[PDB]
Each structure stands twice: as structure tokens, then as C-alpha cells.
Design an enzyme around this catalytic site. Structure first.
Site, short mmCIF file in Angstrom:
data_model
loop_
_atom_site.label_atom_id
_atom_site.label_comp_id
_atom_site.label_asym_id
_atom_site.label_seq_id
_atom_site.Cartn_x
_atom_site.Cartn_y
_atom_site.Cartn_z
N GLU A 29 0.81 -1.21 0.00
CA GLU A 29 0.00 0.00 0.00
C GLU A 29 0.85 1.27 0.00
O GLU A 29 0.35 2.33 0.41
CB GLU A 29 -0.95 0.00 1.20
N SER A 157 -6.21 -2.50 1.41
CA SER A 157 -6.58 -1.89 0.13
C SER A 157 -7.05 -2.93 -0.89
O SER A 157 -6.86 -2.75 -2.09
CB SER A 157 -5.43 -1.06 -0.44
N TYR A 223 -9.78 3.57 -5.10
CA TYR A 223 -8.80 4.62 -5.38
C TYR A 223 -8.83 5.18 -6.79
O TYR A 223 -8.34 6.30 -6.98
CB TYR A 223 -7.38 4.10 -5.09
N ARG A 262 -11.03 2.22 11.86
CA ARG A 262 -12.18 2.04 10.98
C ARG A 262 -12.51 0.56 10.88
O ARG A 262 -11.61 -0.27 10.69
CB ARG A 262 -11.91 2.62 9.59
N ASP A 264 -14.93 -2.43 8.94
CA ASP A 264 -15.64 -2.74 7.71
C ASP A 264 -16.61 -3.88 7.99
O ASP A 264 -16.20 -4.97 8.40
CB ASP A 264 -14.66 -3.12 6.60
N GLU A 277 -13.01 -6.66 9.22
CA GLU A 277 -11.68 -6.31 9.73
C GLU A 277 -11.72 -4.92 10.34
O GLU A 277 -12.69 -4.18 10.19
CB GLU A 277 -10.63 -6.36 8.62
N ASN A 279 -9.05 -1.45 10.71
CA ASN A 279 -7.82 -0.78 10.33
C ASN A 279 -7.41 0.19 11.42
O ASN A 279 -8.24 0.96 11.92
CB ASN A 279 -7.99 -0.06 8.99
N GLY A 283 -6.77 4.86 5.66
CA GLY A 283 -6.36 5.79 4.62
C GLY A 283 -6.92 7.17 4.84
O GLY A 283 -8.02 7.35 5.38
N1 LIG Z 1 -16.81 -11.93 3.73
C1 LIG Z 1 -17.00 -10.97 2.81
N2 LIG Z 1 -18.20 -10.91 2.19
C2 LIG Z 1 -18.39 -9.97 1.27
N3 LIG Z 1 -17.55 -9.02 0.85
C3 LIG Z 1 -16.38 -9.10 1.48
C4 LIG Z 1 -16.02 -10.03 2.46
N4 LIG Z 1 -14.73 -9.81 2.89
C5 LIG Z 1 -14.33 -8.78 2.18
N5 LIG Z 1 -15.28 -8.30 1.31
C6 LIG Z 1 -15.15 -7.19 0.38
O1 LIG Z 1 -13.76 -6.97 0.14
C7 LIG Z 1 -13.39 -5.64 0.53
C8 LIG Z 1 -12.02 -5.68 1.16
O2 LIG Z 1 -12.09 -6.55 2.31
P1 LIG Z 1 -11.29 -6.22 3.62
O3 LIG Z 1 -11.78 -4.88 4.15
O4 LIG Z 1 -11.32 -7.36 4.57
O5 LIG Z 1 -9.85 -5.98 3.01
P2 LIG Z 1 -8.63 -4.98 3.22
O6 LIG Z 1 -7.81 -5.09 1.95
O7 LIG Z 1 -7.88 -5.27 4.46
O8 LIG Z 1 -9.34 -3.53 3.21
P3 LIG Z 1 -8.98 -1.96 3.51
O9 LIG Z 1 -8.86 -1.18 2.24
O10 LIG Z 1 -10.12 -1.46 4.41
O11 LIG Z 1 -7.68 -1.99 4.31
C9 LIG Z 1 -14.50 -5.17 1.47
O12 LIG Z 1 -14.61 -3.75 1.46
C10 LIG Z 1 -15.74 -5.86 0.87
O13 LIG Z 1 -16.29 -5.15 -0.23
MG LIG Z 2 -11.24 -3.04 4.59
MG LIG Z 3 -7.83 -3.33 5.89
#
Ligand SMILES: Nc1ncnc2c1ncn2[C@@H]1O[C@H](COP(=O)(O)OP(=O)(O)OP(=O)(O)O)[C@@H](O)[C@H]1O
Ligand SMILES: [Mg+2]
Ligand SMILES: [Mg+2]
Ligand SMILES: Nc1ncnc2c1ncn2[C@@H]1O[C@H](COP(=O)(O)OP(=O)(O)OP(=O)(O)O)[C@@H](O)[C@H]1O
Ligand SMILES: [Mg+2]
Ligand SMILES: [Mg+2]
Lengths: 317, 317
Positions: A29, A157, A223, A262, A264, A277, A279, A283
Site C-alpha cells: 500500500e 486496500s 482509489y 475504521r 468494515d 476487519e 484498520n 487511509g
Molecule cells: N466476507 C465478505 N463478504 C463480502 N464481501 C467481502 C467479504 N470480505 C471482504 N469483502 C469485500 O472486500 C473488501 C475488502 O475486504 P477487507 O476490508 O477485509 O480488506 P482490506 O484489503 O484489508 O481492506 P482496507 O482497504 O479497508 O484496508 C470489502 O470492502 C468488501 O467489499
Molecule cells: Mg477493509
Molecule cells: Mg484493511
């Protein structure tokens, strides 16, 4: 009165001293962190803070012994920044910093450990499996069905992530995520509205509903795209949004989050919420979500970064 | 064959490069860490390792940019050394190091978080309370009875600890432990034999039974007294010692311990074992316990420190 508590020690920008904005790094990232740092640094400078930036690289320890630093603003993203490692370095150097401490950051970076903690407390998070084999992909398919979503345990991301609808793309997505992390997990796909909930200084900000014509909220939708949909207030009713905010507070306190963060969260066809998850250094780009949540609460970007900075004047865990 | 696996990469001391032995620090166990470092450094030098010592202080980052270091031997004790902070600094500096990673060290330093993880897995650890008030002392007394043992959540070497038999000394012991840590816990006193179990490279070493005429295994009995009793083999039978070793492995894997560590376990009048805590950088003085356990397995002090060093050639978690 709540907004008063959020702006508690934000009145005197000069009171913070010389502030080092830590961004860049060597994680996947990096490009995101470069833009978050540029936003945070420019914001702190316009507020009248004696702020300078540091592109974290092989230069770091040399810069920490050269530069005078009263306080560090961590806006790195991913491993080397949100995983407690940078937090531990700053504690050894005796420099106070923003955000969650060493244990909370390391725990929240690990999606497997995070989900495992939530499960022991009875908090909802999607059923999952750990993938290190094509047989593991078959067992996860037999037990969890389709569709599934594959993710490295320590990324952000949406990097290395894929929604898979069958065994063919499940195995391809596992191999791709394994190039970022030997720790690969696959979750049951939650079909329904997506929310994100920012927290600041122990207060839960307004929830934001997220929508995109992509298969999921991927790196492009976050992004680069123009058709990503952000809705605040979210369509939830008062009882439902309150439920989501109390779930966010419990999910963050479960990991020890401090300062800001934050969460999600997904919602299924039967109204149930599912924690994805948390964070610990979200961002801060002009596409980012925590600034949107702060505006809904009444804080502009400068008040937000000052509030994160004022919270760090106490002690991490 | 097991001892062969313990000495896997110990044959060439020159193969490790320049090794920095990190000791001293600013924690309450500084005097203990100074003697552990002197033992480890002298041991590495006699083995033919290009080893030098670093008294961790305000000097640290300056020394990391001046000195060439191929590998760091962490033999600090307590906060700033075993709590993931030093581990995170070394990862940011790109220096490989011995022992548990950032998340495991930070978790194992916190006795409250450690016990809380064990409880979620059904592992035995004494019933406890958290003390931040004289009313809390009264509630803990009413629920747990007497005697009790008070300890700061983040200390070592029995520092700030006291066995209390009534409410009078309970409150005095709480105030004393609070001078080391706002996190004070009190445990139910386990009356019976005390054991300690060292682990090295995923193998569980012979158990050691500990005895002292003091009220408990305090700082004096550990480091200053002459009448402390060490027994290896412990009086347990094969079935009972195997049970204790399997409990130690589960308790260490629960926290993510790597490289080496030591678990402190009590046994009650009905044979039950109770987990007290795990140390991720155990003492290495000439009074210390991990060297005793290593000798029982067949390793002298030089083989032990070489084995800890050879294990670090892989990756922490
Ligand atoms: N179990 C799930 N069911 C449905 N969609 C999911 C699931 N897990 C993840 N997603 C989708 O994938 C995206 C990214 O998942 P997650 O937030 O876990 O990843 P990240 O790469 O750590 O994110 P971030 O950009 O917040 O750091 C979520 O915003 C959502 O749209
Ligand atoms: Mg996320
Ligand atoms: Mg994340
Ligand atoms: N619940 C208990 N019941 C009985 N004795 C106990 C209990 N907890 C601690 N003790 C005694 O106190 C000693 C120190 O306890 P503990 O190992 O938890 O502390 P520590 O200071 O972190 O130790 P170390 O020197 O291993 O770092 C033990 O060796 C044991 O003799
Ligand atoms: Mg200890
Ligand atoms: Mg102990």
C-alpha cells in the site's frame, strides 16, 4: 457536547511541537500511504503545525537520530506500519505517536487473529478457512460453499483479494494471495449492503454505506474509479444504525484500538451484521472514508488530524 | 535424534556473522538483564562468535546506525525488551533477531491478556481479579478468598509481587504493585509443588521443580538466596510429566511463542496443573532456569545460545 470532547486539545497547533508525519514505507500500500501522508502533512501545515514528512525507507533510523521530533503521526498502511513494528520502534526511541499501541496494531493487522478474537467473544464474523494447499481449497469449498472471498491475512486496500464463484478461481485466487502472504484465509461471501464505521477517540462516527458496480470493493473502486457510491447517512433506521455502532465499539475494544480506527462490516439478506476487519491507520486520501465520516460528525480534515494528534498526548496500550 | 534437531545449525559459529547481544535496558529487571547479557556474551565469545554487547539505553538508535549487525540476540528482560517493542524496532531496522515476534512478545508480557487467551481455549490458569480500587480488593477477597498473590500485569522476576493472607496486606500489596503498573491483577493462591518448563525450538525440555523456604519464589529466592531448591528430574511420574509438557506446548502455542521460552506452572493438592505465565526472553544468569533445563536435555550453555541463534535464521510471526 460530544463534538466538544472530540476537539479537546486541538486549540493550539503550536502546542504539539515538531510533528513527523510517517508515510510511504515498503508495503504493497505504499502508493496509498504516499497520498495519505501528503494529505495529512498538508493539512497539519495549513493548521499551523510545525510538521514535516518522512518517507519511511532504509533511511529511517538515520533520520530519527538527526531530526528533532516531539510527536509522530503514523499514516503508513500495511505491514511495517500498522502491524506494531513501527509502533515498537517509536516506543524504544521514546517518541509519542498516534493510533493504537504495539499489541493492538499487531493483532488488528492479522485478519486471522482478529477474527479468532471476535469468535471467542461471540461477535459475528464470516465463517472461514485457512488455505495452504489445493486440498485445503477443496475442503473449504465442501464446507463453506460458494461464492467465497480470498484475502491475504496481513494485507490492505483489497490487495491480493478476489471473489471466487467456483473451485477453479478459488485455487487461482489462493495462489495469487499467497504471493503476498503465506497466511491465506477464505471467507464465506456475505451478500448485501456494505458499511464502514469510523471511530475517533472512543466515539463511534456516522456509518457510511458503500456501493460499486465492481464484483466487490476492490483496489480500483477504492482509489481509481468514478462510480463508487458513498452514502451518509446510511439507509439504516435509528435502531439498526445504533446496533451497528455498538457492534463497532465492541469489535474495536476487543482488539484494544486506541485513538482512531475504521471497521468494515457487511449486512446479509436477514439484517445480520458481519465484521470483516479493523484498520488501525486508515487511509486519509481524498478518496478515503474516515474523512467522510468525520465530516458527517462535523469535523473538517484539519480538525480530524488535530483530534488524532491530541489523543496521542496520553498513553498507548 | 531430537538432540540432533536441537543442534541443527550450531556447527559453524562464524556462519552467524556479527551478533549484537542486547541487554540492560531501563526496566525493573535491568540488573538481571545485565547478568544474563554478560553470560550470553561471554558464552558466544568462547564459542567463536563475532559477538559484541549493547547496553540498551538512550544510545540505541545511534548504535544501530554505527555498528554492523548481522543478527541480534535479545536478552533484555521486561518492558522495552520482551513486550514486542524491541522486536518491532529490529524489524524496522531489517535486523533478524532471536525469540518470539512482535505479537507473541507483546501478548506474553501482559499476564492479563495471556491468562485471558488461555481461558478462551480451556487451558487452566488461576481464577483472578483486576485491582484498581480498595473496593476491588474487597470484591476480589469476597469472591476468591485467601490467600491471594498480587502481581503487576507486565513485570518479571517477582518484582512488585506479594502473597497476601488478608484484606490488610492485600490492599498494601495492590498499592505497591500499582507503582510498577496501573494494571494490577490478583490470583488465587495455588498451594502445592511449583514447576517450570523450558521450551527450545518447538521442543519441550525436562521440567524443573522449584522450592524455597520463602513465602513464594520471590526476587531474593531467584537471584540472591542460597537455600533455593532445584530438582531435575522432577518427582512426577512419566504420565504426569508428559501431561505437564503437553500443557506447556499448548500454552506456548496459544500465544505464538517461537525460538525459546519458559512456562511457570503450579500444581495443587489434587494433582491439577495451573498455568501462571510464559517468558519470551527468560533469564540466562548462573542462577537461571532455562540453562538448568538445557543441561538436563544434554546441552551446555554454549550449545543452548547457539541453538537459540540458529533458530532465528528463519522468520518470526
Ligand atoms: N466476507 C465478505 N463478504 C463480502 N464481501 C467481502 C467479504 N470480505 C471482504 N469483502 C469485500 O472486500 C473488501 C475488502 O475486504 P477487507 O476490508 O477485509 O480488506 P482490506 O484489503 O484489508 O481492506 P482496507 O482497504 O479497508 O484496508 C470489502 O470492502 C468488501 O467489499
Ligand atoms: Mg477493509
Ligand atoms: Mg484493511
Ligand atoms: N497463583 C499463584 N499461586 C501460587 N504461587 C504463585 C502464583 N502466581 C505466582 N506465584 C509465585 O510467584 C512467583 C512469580 O510469579 P510469576 O512467575 O507469575 O511472576 P514473574 O515476576 O513474571 O516471574 P519470572 O521471574 O518468571 O519472570 C512464581 O514463581 C510462584 O512461586
Ligand atoms: Mg515472568
Ligand atoms: Mg515467572
Amino acid at each position: 457536547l460530544c463534538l466538544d470532547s472530540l476537539l479537546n486539545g486541538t486549540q493550539d497547533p503550536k502546542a504539539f511541537g515538531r510533528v513527523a508525519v510517517l508515510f510511504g514505507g515498503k508495503s504493497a500500500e505504499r502508493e496509498v500511504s504516499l497520498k495519505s501522508g501528503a494529505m495529512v502533512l498538508q493539512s497539519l501545515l495549513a493548521a499551523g503545525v510545525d510538521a514535516f514528512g518522512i518517507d519511511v525507507g532504509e533511511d529511517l533510523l538515520q533520520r530519527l537520530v538527526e531530526e528533532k521530533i516531539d510527536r509522530a503521526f503514523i499514516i503508513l498502511h500495511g505491514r511495517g506500519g500498522e502491524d506494531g513494528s513501527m509502533q515498537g520502534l517509536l516506543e524504544c526511541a521514546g517518541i509519542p505517536y498516534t493510533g493504537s499501541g504495539v499489541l493492538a496494531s499487531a493483532l488488528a493487522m492479522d485478519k486471522l487473529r482478529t477474527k479468532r478474537v471476535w469468535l471467542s467473544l461471540g461477535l459475528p464474523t464470516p465463517d472461514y478457512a485457512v488455505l495452504a494447499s489445493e486440498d485445503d481449497c477443496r475442503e473449504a469449498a465442501q464446507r463453506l460453499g460458494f461464492p467465497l472471498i480470498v484475502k491475504p491475512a496481513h494485507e490492505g486496500s483489497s490487495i491480493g483479494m478476489a471473489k471466487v464463484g467456483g473451485l477453479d478461481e478459488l485455487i487461482a485466487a489462493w495462489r495469487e494471495a499467497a504471493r503476498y502472504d503465506s497466511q491465506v484465509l477464505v471467507e464465506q461471501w456475505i451478500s448485501g449492503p456494505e458499511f464502514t464505521v469510523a471511530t475517533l477517540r472512543g466515539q463511534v462516527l456516522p456509518a457510511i454505506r458503500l456501493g460499486t458496480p465492481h464484483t466487490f470493493y476492490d483496489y480500483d473502486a477504492k482509489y481509481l474509479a468514478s462510480d463508487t457510491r458513498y452514502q451518509v447517512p446510511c439507509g439504516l433506521d435509528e435502531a439498526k444504525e445504533r446496533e451497528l455502532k455498538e457492534l463497532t465499539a465492541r469489535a474495536c475494544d476487543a482488539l484494544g484500538i486506541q485513538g482512531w480506527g475504521r471497521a468494515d462490516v457487511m449486512q446479509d439478506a436477514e439484517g445480520r451484521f458481519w465484521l470483516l476487519e479493523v484498520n488501525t491507520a486508515p487511509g486519509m486520501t481524498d478518496h478515503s472514508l474516515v474523512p467522510m465520516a468525520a465530516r458527517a460528525a462535523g469535523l473538517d480534515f484539519q480538525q480530524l488530524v488535530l483530534a488524532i494528534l491530541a489523543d496521542s498526548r496520553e498513553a498507548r496500550g
